[PDB]
Every structure is written in structure tokens, then in C-alpha cells.
């Protein structure tokens, strides 16, 4: 019977949607973490310098 | 008690998305439970009964 | 049992497995963004060495 093939598309729909956010949530993350270091390592150039 | 009534083997278990469940129904509705199988909520899973005990 | 029961079961499996791309794709693209911080400092490290041989 058909609706078996909905019930699967809804939970498919839910982890293609749950991938899309974790996808999103490393390229933040990634934005965060060159904030985190390349500031810090130039201070510590300019420190030395 | 149901511990010699039902097995693991008698239940979908250890899903993100499905469960089954135990419904008791008077002996003389088992034909308006089984028309009401497909029908009685919404994301049941179609044509998937099955009888463990009767009494 | 019905079949279709396993066919959602097989969708569950796939449902884990795409969101464990996103967190295997997560995994592996956290040492780009040291791989590119590494390349950004050593502008700053070169044009600081560089004034310095200057003043020298």
C-alpha cells in the first residue's frame, strides 16, 4: 500500500534536513575557529617582533 | 503479567521512527478494530496486525 | 511482518548514514580551517620579518 512510501520520505526529508543543519553548523564553527587563531598567532607575531 | 505471552520477535524495537504497541479489544469488535486498522490515526503502518492472545 | 516495515527500517539506515556524511564532512573540514589560518599567519610572520631586515 502507498503510504508506506510517505512515512519513509518523512524521516528521509528529517535527516535531509538534519544533515543541511549540521552542514551549516561546521561551516559557523569553522568561521569561529580561524577567528580563534589566526588573530592570536598574528598578536604573538607582532608580540615578538 | 504478559511474560508468556510475547516475545521480542513480536515487536518492532530499536528504531528512530517506528514502535509497536498492545491494544486488547472485546472479542466481538475484532471486526471494527480491523476496520479501523488503516484508519484510526494518522502514519500507522498499513496492513500489519497480528493477534498474540485471546481470551 | 509485511515488508514495508523493513523498506522504513532500510530508510532509518539511510537517515543515520546522511547525517553522518554531515558529521564526517564536519570532521574532516575542521583541519581546513587550520590549514588556511596556517597560511594566513605566515603573511603577517613574512611582512613583520621583512620590516625587520628594513630596520636592520
Known sequence: QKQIKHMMAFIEQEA?????????????????????????????????? | S?????????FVLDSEYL????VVVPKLN?????????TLAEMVVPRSSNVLSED | QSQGIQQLLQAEKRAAEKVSEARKRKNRRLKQAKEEAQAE?????????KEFKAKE
Open chain 2, 2 to 10: 504478559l511474560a508468556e505471552i510475547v516475545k521480542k520477535d513480536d
Open chain 1, 16 to 49: 535531509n534536513e538534519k544533515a543541511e543543519e549540521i552542514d551549516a553548523k561546521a561551516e559557523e564553527e569553522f568561521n569561529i575557529e580561524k577567528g580563534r587563531l589566526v588573530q592570536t598567532q598574528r598578536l604573538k607575531i607582532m608580540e615578538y617582533y
Open chain 2, 30 to 38: 475484532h471486526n471494527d478494530w480491523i476496520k479501523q486498522y488503516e
Open chain 2, 19 to 22: 514502535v509497536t504497541l498492545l
Open chain 3, 41 to 49: 599567519i605566515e603573511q603577517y610572520r613574512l611582512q613583520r620579518e
